[PDB]
DNA sequence: TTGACTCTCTTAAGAGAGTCA
DNA sequence: TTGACTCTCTTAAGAGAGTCA
């Protein structure tokens, strides 16, 4: 298995690589009405992507490294994390984008939580209106908002109350 | 079938078959520290479980009725809008469970909305905790709250800013 | 060892349709 | 006609693994 030095040194040369990748500065809603920026550094949209990097589905890529003639492979997103735990509560641990921006490999953007808390996400009012996440978000859930409902409850006799 | 006449008569035996279904009274957070009372009417666990309804999956049903001998089935929550437009800016439209409560066919607990809009209402803080879906959430979503993170955003080098 | 492709799978909110009696 | 089962599919947040040169 792989020592804990050497996790790192593969955390490291992601990160080199990912630093490189085009930065996009994005201006976000932050909630209550403010607005932030964030600065996404997104892997390119077609091959090459970068050393390790390569691309097993549409927004799906994974960072492969071979260490003593052994190939190993990680989700994209997951790097950051490979010295944490990998579930809590009984459910397996994702990387979830605080950007909301799927191609941003930025480690600042991303944290490392179950689906259900890393779907929530995308219907939180931000930081700045009423994020109650623990690891706070970086901006509101690009789903925040009224919704667009075409049909509210409703009967048409009387068999059924609240 | 075809006609309004055909479809209000599905909506009413629907309502009626719903409307003999086992009432439920759950108890219910609806945020800023209130609770609620709703009524759910159950589908039954196992069969039989009303005339017209079928399991197809562990909490999937269906309800079919033969109308001009023809035998005509729709998923079983979705009977309440079948007068309504069926797709919402190019997305599905689906039922969606404001008591979060799926064997519950109380039509005065579902909506017609986006898959998205649906799925949100399980973060929502509820209707008086800062619900802002235009068509109001019943309570509180089951999954809102701090999240259980393992780990937040962080770089090992100092190629990265937020 | 490496790049650029290929494939199918998970989850939890939701669906459609066929086989029998 | 009605009931009680069987099967796979959709979405959008996420995954693992194979082939070839
Ligand atoms: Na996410
Ligand atoms: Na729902
Ligand atoms: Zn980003
Ligand atoms: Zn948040
Ligand atoms: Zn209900
Ligand atoms: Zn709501």
Same mark, same amino acid.
């Given at each position: 298995?792989?020592?804990? +030095? &050497?996790?790192? #040194?593969?955390?490291?040369?992601? !990160? !080199?690589?990912?630093?490189?990748?085009?930065?996009?500065?994005?201006?976000?809603?932050?909630?209550?009405?403010?607005?932030?920026?964030?600065?996404?550094?997104?892997? $390119?949209? +077609? +091959? *090459?992507?970068?050393?390790?990097?390569?691309?097993?589905?549409?927004?799906?890529?994974?960072? %492969?490294?071979?260490?003593? &003639?052994?190939?190993?492979? =990680?989700?994209?997103?997951?790097?950051?994390?490979?010295?944490?735990?990998?579930?809590?509560?009984? %459910?397996? @641990?994702? +990387? /979830?984008?605080?950007?909301?921006?799927?191609?941003?490999?930025?480690?600042?953007?991303? @944290?490392?939580? /179950?689906?259900?808390?890393?779907?929530?996400?995308? =219907?939180?009012?931000? $930081?700045?209106?009423? @994020?109650?996440? #623990?690891?706070? @978000?970086?901006? &509101?859930? $690009?789903?925040?908002? *009224?919704? #667009?409902?075409? #049909?509210? $409850?409703? &009967?048409?006799? /009387?068999?059924?109350?609240?």
């Amino acid at each position: 298995a792989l020592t804990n +030095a &050497q996790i790192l #040194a593969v955390i490291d040369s992601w !990160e !080199e690589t990912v630093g490189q990748f085009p930065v996009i500065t994005h201006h976000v809603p932050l909630g209550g009405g403010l607005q932030g920026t964030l600065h996404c550094y997104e892997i $390119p949209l +077609a +091959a *090459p992507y970068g050393v390790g990097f390569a691309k097993n589905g549409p927004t799906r890529w994974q960072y %492969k490294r071979t260490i003593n &003639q052994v190939v190993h492979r =990680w989700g994209s997103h997951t790097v950051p994390f490979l010295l944490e735990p990998d579930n809590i509560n009984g %459910k397996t @641990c994702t +990387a /979830s984008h605080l950007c909301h921006n799927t191609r941003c490999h930025n480690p600042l953007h991303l @944290c490392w939580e /179950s689906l259900d808390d890393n779907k929530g996400r995308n =219907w939180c009012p931000g $930081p700045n209106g009423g @994020c109650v996440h #623990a690891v706070v @978000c970086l901006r &509101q859930g $690009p789903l925040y908002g *009224p919704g #667009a409902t075409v #049909a509210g $409850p409703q &009967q048409r006799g /009387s068999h059924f109350v609240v």
